[PDB]
Amino acid sequence: SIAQARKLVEQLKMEANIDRIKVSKAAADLMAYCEAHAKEDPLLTPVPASENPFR
Amino acid sequence: DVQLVESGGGLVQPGGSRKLSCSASGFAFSSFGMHWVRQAPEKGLEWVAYISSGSGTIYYADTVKGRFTISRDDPKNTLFLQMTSLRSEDTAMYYCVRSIYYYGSSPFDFWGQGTTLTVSGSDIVMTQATSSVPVTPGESVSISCRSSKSLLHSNGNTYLYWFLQRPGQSPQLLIYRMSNLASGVPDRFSGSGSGTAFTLTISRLEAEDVGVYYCMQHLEYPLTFGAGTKLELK
Amino acid sequence: SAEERAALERSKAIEKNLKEDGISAAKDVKLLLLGADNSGKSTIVKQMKITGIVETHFTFKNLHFRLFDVGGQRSERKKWIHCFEDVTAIIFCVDLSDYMHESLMLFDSICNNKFFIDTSIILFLNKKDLFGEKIKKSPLTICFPEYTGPNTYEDAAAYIQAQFESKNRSPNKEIYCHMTCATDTNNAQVIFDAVTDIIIANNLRGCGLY
Amino acid sequence: YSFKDMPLXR
Amino acid sequence: LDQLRQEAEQLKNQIRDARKACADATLSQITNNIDPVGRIQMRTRRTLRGHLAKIYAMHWGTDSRLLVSASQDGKLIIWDSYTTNKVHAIPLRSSWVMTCAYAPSGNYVACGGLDNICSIYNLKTREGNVRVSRELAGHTGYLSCCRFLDDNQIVTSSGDTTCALWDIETGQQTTTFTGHTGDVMSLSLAPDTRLFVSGACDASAKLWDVREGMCRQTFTGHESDINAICFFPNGNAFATGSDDATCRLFDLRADQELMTYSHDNIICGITSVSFSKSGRLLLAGYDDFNCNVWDALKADRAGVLAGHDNRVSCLGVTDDGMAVATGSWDSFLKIWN
Amino acid sequence: WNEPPVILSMVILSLTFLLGLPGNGLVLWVAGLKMQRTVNTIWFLHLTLADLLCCLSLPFSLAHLALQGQWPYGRFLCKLIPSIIVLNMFASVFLLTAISLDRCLVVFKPIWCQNHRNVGMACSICGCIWVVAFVMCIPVFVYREIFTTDNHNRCGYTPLVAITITRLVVGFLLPSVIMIACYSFIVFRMQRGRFAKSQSKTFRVAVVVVAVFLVCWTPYHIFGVLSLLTDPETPLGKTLMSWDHVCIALASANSCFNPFLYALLGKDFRKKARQSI
C-alpha cells in the first residue's frame, strides 16, 4: 500500500500549492454579488399579481 | 420510417357511397391524431374532418357535416372516412394529415400522399391578395396572409401555420404557430406576424423552393385555408 | 382553450393510464430478502423458481410475490435501506453450519431499525443436516462460551432460536421461525401463510379494530 | 283514514 | 510507511496552518450592517397530484416551464408547471430510482438508481413516444445524481466512491474521478460547466475538474455524511447540507468555512439544498417535515416552507427565480412562489 | 308548553346538536381534505355526510316540537323534510352495516381482499347503499298531505302496516343481525395465535359499538310498532306519541355518537386531526 500513500502525499502536496485569497475579499464580493442581483430576484421581493405567472 | 398511404379512389356514380381508408406505419398511431383535407383540381386546400386521440372528439366542416363519418381503428393502425351521397362538388385531392397536441408539439408535421376521387358566417376567413409572384433565384420573396379576426390567443400563442406544396408532391410544413420553425427544413425560411397580417419571409431563394403556398389558422374549427399564393421561376 | 383542449384530453388519458397502472401494481406483495453472505440466499431464491439488485417475482396461490435480493450492494446500508419501506415482511436467512456473531449483529441492526419497527421478520434456518453432523463432531459452544447445557441437537437449535428471538423489542412485530435442510420443497407454504398472517394483521391495524 | 300526526321521523 | 505517514501528517498540518492564517474574520462579522430579508412567506400556488409512491427527485427544465419528477412507481413524468397538465409518462425498467436530470436543450431526460445503470431518454423523437437512447453501465455502486453538461457529456456520481464523466455518443467512460473514501451522494455542475464538486459520505466535499480529471480541493468541516450540495450562482461558492442537522457554506478561493446554519430547535438532517437567483435565500430541505428558509448572509430563519405531509426529498428553484418546487414522500409536488 | 316528554326531547336534541355539529364538521374536513383517499376513508366520509345531514335537519324537528304541529311552511317543505331525514338516517344505518360487513370480510378472506379490493369497489357499494336508501325513502314522498283542521293545520298522514313492517325489517333485523354476527366472528377469529395480546381490545370495541347501536334504535322501533298496535284516541296512545319525540331524539343522538365511535378509533386519523386542531 506504499503506492496509495505516495498518491495521497502527492495529492496533498498539489493541493497545498494553491494560492489562497483572504476570506474578507470572498465575503466582500459575495455580498456584492448578492446585492447586485437584488432587483432581479422575485422571491425576496413579492411579485405583483398581474405579473405573477402562477396567479 | 414514417409513411402514410391511402386507398379507395376512383370514379363514383352520382348519389352513391364509398369508404376511404388512411393506412399508417412507422409511428405510434394510437397516440396521434389524424386530419383530413381536400384539394380541388384547380383551387387550393380545404378542411374535411378530424378525430382526436382515443376517438374522443370528432369535428366536421359546415359543408360536409351530417354526410360523412370519420373513424379510427387504433389496433389496425388505419384511419377511416365513410362518405355518402356523392354530389358534384366532392371531387378533389383528399390528403391524410398527422397531428399531435401538447406543449411544444408540431401539428400537421407529416402529410400523406393523397387519393383521387371523381364524381360527375362566423367562420374565420383567410385571404391573400398575391396569387402569382414571379421571381428569379437568389432574391428574397415574402408572402402575405391576412386575417378577418385576430389569431393571437390570450396565452400568447398565435395559431397561423405555413405550408408549402411543391408541384407533383404533397404539402409540407415550414413554419408552425407563425414563429417557430419546422424540423429538417433549411434555416433560410422564416416567419412573422402580428394580430391579422402575417408574412412568411424567405431568404436566398433556390430552384427547389418553387410551388404554391398555403396559410392555415388554428384558433377554432373549422380550419379554413387561404386561396393560395404561387411562386414561380422568372 | 383553442388548441389546449387536446392537451387536456391527453393529460386526462395519461392520468387514467397512471391510475390503472397503480391499481394493477398495488396487488403485488413485496418481500425483502436479507442476510449474511453465502447463507443460502441463492438456493432459496432458486427454490421458488425464476448487478446491484436481483428482483425475482413469481405467483403462488393467486398471490404475487416479489423478492429483492439486495445483498450484492457493496455500500452503506443506511443510505439506501430507507427506500425498502412498505414491504410486507423481511426474509432473513442464516447459515448455521459456518461460524456467527456477524449474523447476530446484522439481525440486531435490522430488527431495531427505525423504518422496520412494524414490519415483521421471517427467520429462515438452513443446513440442518450439516449442523447436526457438526454437533456429532464438535460441541456447539465454540462460538457460544456463555452457553451451558446438553449438546443435544434439539436443545442447541432451541438455544440458537432463543438468541435470535431475544433481539426484538417491538410487541407489534413478530418473528416467524423455521427449519430447513436444503432438501425440503415445502418452504413456499411457510412464506405464503406468514404473508397471509401479516396481511391480516396490517388490515386489522389499518381499520382501527386492532 | 282517521287522523294521525307524527313529528317527522316516520 | 512510517515516514510516509509523518509526511502526510505534516502536510495536513501545513495546509491547516495555511487556511488558518488567512482567516482574519468570519462572514458574520462583516455582514452585520445589512438589512435582513425579514419574514419571507410563501403560498402553495399549485399542487400537482400525479404520483402514488415516494418522490425522490424533481429537476426544473431549462425553460423554467417543465418539471420532471421521479418516484418508486417506475414513472418519470414531465409536467407543465403553468397549467398542471401532464405531457409525458415514461415507464422505467427499474422502479428503484433516486435521481433525475433534464437536458439543457430539453431533448433528453436521465434517471438512475439502484440498478447501477444511468438511462438516457430521448424526448423529441420523430416516431412519437419516448424511447431509450442509451444505457450507461460502468459503476459498481448505486448512482446518486446525474447532471447534463450538454446533449453529449453527462457526469454521474455513484455510490462506489468515485465519480465518472460519460459520453452519450459512444457510452464509454471518458474520465473517472477517484479519491473519496465514503459514498458520494450529491453532485452539482458549475454555471460555466468547467468544474464541479461531489458530496461523499465521509464528511468531505471535494472540488473536481471535468477536463483535467484531477482533484483540486478538499473540504473537511462536517461531522456526518453529506446528503446534498449546490453551487452559489456566482460559481465561486457552494453550500452543503449533511445529516448532522446543519448546512455549511464554503468558498472556493478561501478554501475554508463561512457560516454554519444551525438552530437548536432543529434536529433532523438535510435532504436538499438550493439557492435563488440573487443567492440571498438558501432554501434547504429537512427531514423534520418542513423546509426552512435560510438567509445566506445572516444565518437566520426568514420563514418556514411547511405544508408537506412527509419528509421532503428534493428542492429546486427555476432558472428565472419565479418559483420553487419541493418533492416529498407523500407523492405530492407542491410548487410554491 | 308544559309536558315532561317535550322538554326532555328538546334538551336531548340540543345536546345532540352541540355534540354532533363540531365533531362531524371536524371529521369531514380532516378525512376529506387533510387525509388521503384510502379504501377505509370512503365509509367514514359517507357516514359523516349522512350524520351531518341529520344534524342539519334537526332544527326542523326542534321547531316542530316547539309548536307541536301547525306546519307554518308550504306543502313542499312537509313533502321534502320528513323524507330527507329518513334518507339520511337510513343511509347512516346501512353505512354502519357495510362497515361491519367489510370488517368481517377483510379478515375471513385475506387472499381475496388484496386483489379485488380498491376505492372503486367502495364507491360502488356506497352508491348502491344510497340508491337503496332512496328507494326506501320514496314511499313517504307520495303519501303526505295537509289536513284542513282548524286555522292552525298540522301536516301529516292501510299501507301504514306495510311501510312500517318493511321499515322495521330492513332497518332493524338485518343490520343488527349482520353487525352481531360479523363482530362475534371477528372476536372468535382473533383468538387463534399471535393475537392473544389482542381480543381484549377488539372484544371491548365490538361489544361497545353493538351495544350503542342496539340501545340507540330499539326504543324507536318498539314505539313505532306500538303505534300500530295501540289504537288512537286513547291516553296510552297519547303518551306513546308524546315519548315518540324522545325516541326520535335518541335516534338522532345515535348519529351524533357515530363519529366518536367509528372515526376516532383510527389512531392515525385522530393524530392528524389533533395536529390540524
Q: What is the 3-state secondary structure (H, E, C) of chain C?
A: CCCHHHHHHHHHHHHHHHHHHHHHHCCCEEEEEEECCCCCHHHHHHHCCCCCCEEEEEECCCCEEEEEECCCCCCCHHHCHHHHCCCCEEEEEEECCCCCHHHHHHHHHHHCCCCCCCCEEEEEEECHHHHHHHHHHCCCCCCCCCCCCCCCHHHHHHHHHHHHHCCCCCCCCCEEEEECCCCCCCHHHHHHHHHHHHHHHHHHHHHCCC
Identify any residues that bridge with C91 across adjacent strands, giving them in sequence order: C33, C122
Beta carbons of E56 and E315 less than 8 angstroms apart: no
φ/ψ (deg, to 5) at E287: -85, 0
Beta carbons of F248 and F9 less than 8 angstroms apart: yes
Beta carbons of F95 and F170 less than 8 angstroms apart: no
Beta carbons of C168 and C117 less than 8 angstroms apart: no
Spatial distance between the Cα atoms of B46 and B91, rounded to a whole number of angstroms = 12
Spatial distance between the Cα atoms of B66 and F62, rounded to a whole number of angstroms = 60
F→C interface, C-beta within 8 Å: 38, 40, 103, 106-107, 110-111, 113-115, 118, 120, 186, 190, 194, 197-198, 201-202, 205-206, 265-267
Spatial distance between the Cα atoms of F45 and F33, rounded to a whole number of angstroms = 11
The answer to whether the bond into B222 is cis (omega within 30° of 0) is yes
Spatial distance between the Cα atoms of B214 and B216, rounded to a whole number of angstroms = 7
DSSP 3-state helix, strand, coil percentages of chain A (rounded to 5)?
55, 0, 45
F176 HSE (CA, 13 A, CB side):
15
Spatial distance between the Cα atoms of E296 and E258, rounded to a whole number of angstroms = 10
Spatial neighbors of A17 by CB under 8 A, at least 6 apart, are none
Amino acid present at B69: T
With the C-alpha atoms ordered E181, E182, E183, E189, is the resulting torsion angle positive or negative?
A: negative
Question: Cβ–Cβ of C2/B52 closer than 8 Å?
Answer: no
Cell 456473531 belongs to C101
For residue E213, how many other CB atoms are within 10 A of its CB? 13
As a residue count, chain F comes to: 277
H/E segment holding residue E166: strand E162-167
H/E segment holding residue F118: none
For residue E16, how many other CB atoms are within 10 A of its CB? 11
Beta carbons of F92 and F47 less than 8 angstroms apart: yes
- Beta strands C29-35 and B229-233 are unpaired
Q: How far is CA E330 from CA C19, C43, E55, E71, E317, in A?
A: 16, 37, 7, 10, 20
SS3 label, residue E282: strand
Spatial distance between the Cα atoms of B60 and B49, rounded to a whole number of angstroms = 5
All domains of chain B in start order, with CATH? 3-119 (2.60.40.10), 126-232 (2.60.40.10)
Q: Is F143 left (phi over 0), alpha (psi -120 to 50) or beta?
A: alpha
Cell 389533533 belongs to F274
C61 in contact with chain F, both atoms CB, cutoff 8 A: yes
Helix crossing, F267-276 with F4-29: angle to 10°? 90
Spatial distance between the Cα atoms of B215 and B197, rounded to a whole number of angstroms = 11
Cell 494560492 belongs to A19
Burial class (CB in 10 A: 0-12, 13-18, 19+), C202: middle
Spatial distance between the Cα atoms of C95 and F221, rounded to a whole number of angstroms = 67
Spatial distance between the Cα atoms of E74 and B106, rounded to a whole number of angstroms = 28
Beta carbons of C140 and C152 less than 8 angstroms apart: no
Joined grid coordinates for residue C12: 386526462
- Beta strands C120-126 and C89-95 are parallel
Spatial distance between the Cα atoms of E83 and B155, rounded to a whole number of angstroms = 11
Spatial neighbors of C46 by CB under 8 A, at least 6 apart, are none
Burial class (CB in 10 A: 0-12, 13-18, 19+), E169: exposed
Question: Cβ–Cβ of F61/D6 closer than 8 Å?
Answer: no
**Domain extent at residue A30:** 2-54
For residue C210, how many other CB atoms are within 10 A of its CB? 19
For residue F162, how many other CB atoms are within 10 A of its CB? 10
φ/ψ (deg, to 5) at F154: -95, 130
H/E segment holding residue F236: helix F235-262
Spatial distance between the Cα atoms of F241 and F223, rounded to a whole number of angstroms = 8
Joined grid coordinates for residue F73: 311552511
Q: Looking at the partner chain, which of E72, E96, E183 has a beta carbon nearest the beta carbon of C76?
A: E183
SS3 label, residue E332: coil
Amino acid present at E246: T
Joined grid coordinates for residue F13: 336534541
For residue A13, how many other CB atoms are within 10 A of its CB? 14
Spatial distance between the Cα atoms of C189 and E229, rounded to a whole number of angstroms = 48
Amino acid present at E307: G
SS3 label, residue F227: helix
Burial class (CB in 10 A: 0-12, 13-18, 19+), C77: middle
A→E interface, C-beta within 8 Å: 2, 5-6, 8-9, 11-16, 18, 20-31, 33-34, 37-38, 40-44, 47, 52-55
SS3 label, residue F80: helix
Question: Cβ–Cβ of F267/C208 closer than 8 Å?
Answer: yes
Spatial distance between the Cα atoms of E232 and E278, rounded to a whole number of angstroms = 9
Number of separate domains in chain A: 1
Q: Looking at the partner chain, which of A11, A13, A23 has a beta carbon nearest the beta carbon of E251?
A: A23
Instruction: Give residue C117's Cα distance to chain centre.
Output: 14
Amino acid present at C2: A
* End-to-end CA gap in chain B: 36
Beta carbons of B100 and C10 less than 8 angstroms apart: no
Structural domain includes residue C163: yes
All domains of chain F in start order, with CATH? 4-276 (1.20.1070.10)
Helix crossing, F235-262 with F202-229: angle to 10°? 160
> What is the CATH number assigned to the segment(s) E1-337?
2.130.10.10
Q: Looking at the partner chain, which of E86, E201, E225 has a beta carbon nearest the beta carbon of C14?
A: E86
Q: What is the 3-state secondary structure (H, E, C) of F41-64?
A: HHHHHHHHHHHHHHHHHHHHHHHH
Q: How far is A49 from chain E (nearest CA, A)?
A: 11
Q: What is the 3-state secondary structure (H, E, C) of E92-158?
A: CCCCCEEEEEECCCCCEEEEEECCCCEEEEECCECCECCEEEEEECCCCCCEEEEEECCCCEEEEEE
Beta carbons of E52 and C24 less than 8 angstroms apart: no
Interface-testing mutation among B34, B52, B147, B219, with chain C (most C C-beta atoms within 10 A): B52
Beta carbons of B177 and B161 less than 8 angstroms apart: yes
Structural domain includes residue C63: yes
Closest CA to F58 of F262, F253, F223, F213: F253
Spatial distance between the Cα atoms of C88 and C32, rounded to a whole number of angstroms = 8
Q: How far is B14 from chain E (nearest CA, A)?
A: 40
Joined grid coordinates for residue B216: 392555415
CATH number assigned to the domain comprising residue C175: 3.40.50.300
Beta strands per DSSP E along E195-290: 195-199, 205-209, 218-219, 226-231, 237-242, 247-251, 256-261, 270-275, 281-286
Enter the DSSP assignment of F117. Answer: -
Spatial distance between the Cα atoms of F43 and F59, rounded to a whole number of angstroms = 26
SS3 label, residue B99: strand
Spatial neighbors of F146 by CB under 8 A, at least 6 apart, are F71, F75, F78, F153, F154, F155
With the C-alpha atoms ordered C41, C45, C51, C53, is the resulting torsion angle positive or negative?
A: negative
For residue B146, how many other CB atoms are within 10 A of its CB? 15
Joined grid coordinates for residue F161: 302496516
SS3 label, residue B194: strand
Joined grid coordinates for residue B134: 414571379
Burial class (CB in 10 A: 0-12, 13-18, 19+), C168: middle
Identify any residues that bridge with C163 across adjacent strands, giving them in sequence order: none
Burial class (CB in 10 A: 0-12, 13-18, 19+), E306: exposed
Beta carbons of F176 and F213 less than 8 angstroms apart: yes
Instruction: Give alpha helix (H) positions in F68-118.
Output: 75-108, 112-115
Spatial distance between the Cα atoms of B21 and B4, rounded to a whole number of angstroms = 11
Spatial distance between the Cα atoms of A32 and E30, rounded to a whole number of angstroms = 12
Q: How far is CA F7 from CA F1, F62, F66, F125, F256, in A?
A: 8, 11, 9, 40, 19
Beta carbons of E232 and E248 less than 8 angstroms apart: no
Joined grid coordinates for residue F203: 372484544
Per CB-CB distance under 8 Å, the chain B contacts of C2 are 153, 159, 218-220
Beta carbons of E256 and E250 less than 8 angstroms apart: yes
As a residue count, chain D comes to: 10
Structural domain includes residue C50: yes
For residue F12, how many other CB atoms are within 10 A of its CB? 18
H/E segment holding residue E224: none
- Beta strands F155-156 and E186-189 are unpaired
Please give the method by which this entry was determined: cryo-EM
Structural domain includes residue C16: no
Q: Is B23 left (phi over 0), alpha (psi -120 to 50) or beta?
A: beta
Inspect the structure and tell me whether chains F and B have 3 or more CB pairs less than 8 Å apart.
no
Beta carbons of E99 and E117 less than 8 angstroms apart: no
Spatial distance between the Cα atoms of E75 and B39, rounded to a whole number of angstroms = 44
Spatial distance between the Cα atoms of B233 and B227, rounded to a whole number of angstroms = 20
- Beta strands B229-233 and B132-135 are parallel
Q: How far is CA E27 from CA A30, E174, E221, F167, in A?
A: 10, 39, 16, 79
Instruction: Give residue E22's Cα distance to chain centre.
Output: 29
Spatial neighbors of E53 by CB under 8 A, at least 6 apart, are E71, E72, E73, E331
Beta carbons of E326 and E284 less than 8 angstroms apart: no
Spatial distance between the Cα atoms of F245 and F228, rounded to a whole number of angstroms = 16
φ/ψ (deg, to 5) at B77: 55, 45
Subunits with 3+ C-beta pairs closer than 8 A to A: E
Rg of chain C (C-alpha set): 21
Cell 295501540 belongs to F230
For residue B73, how many other CB atoms are within 10 A of its CB? 12
Identify any residues that bridge with B72 across adjacent strands, giving them in sequence order: B79
Beta carbons of C32 and B124 less than 8 angstroms apart: no
Closest CA to F86 of F21, F179, F175, F164: F164
CB neighbour burial string for B119-142, b if at least 16 within 10 angstroms, e if fewer: beeeebebebebeeeebeeeeebe
Beta carbons of F186 and F206 less than 8 angstroms apart: yes
Q: What is the 3-state secondary structure (H, E, C) of C142-176?
A: CCCCCCCCCCCHHHHHHHHHHHHHCCCCCCCCCEE
Beta carbons of C164 and C111 less than 8 angstroms apart: no
Q: How far is E127 from chain B (nearest CA, A)?
A: 5
As a residue count, chain B comes to: 234
Number of H helices, E strands in chain B: 0, 20
Q: How far is C40 from chain E (nearest CA, A)?
A: 23
Joined grid coordinates for residue F96: 354502519
Structural domain includes residue C14: no
CATH number assigned to the domain comprising residue A26: 4.10.260.10
Beta carbons of E25 and A24 less than 8 angstroms apart: yes
Name the closest residue on chain E to residue C54, using Cα atoms. E115
Amino acid present at F6: V
Spatial neighbors of C203 by CB under 8 A, at least 6 apart, are F106, F107, F110, F113
Resolution of the structure, angstroms: 3.4
Q: What would you measure as the largest C-alpha separation in chain F, in angstroms?
A: 71
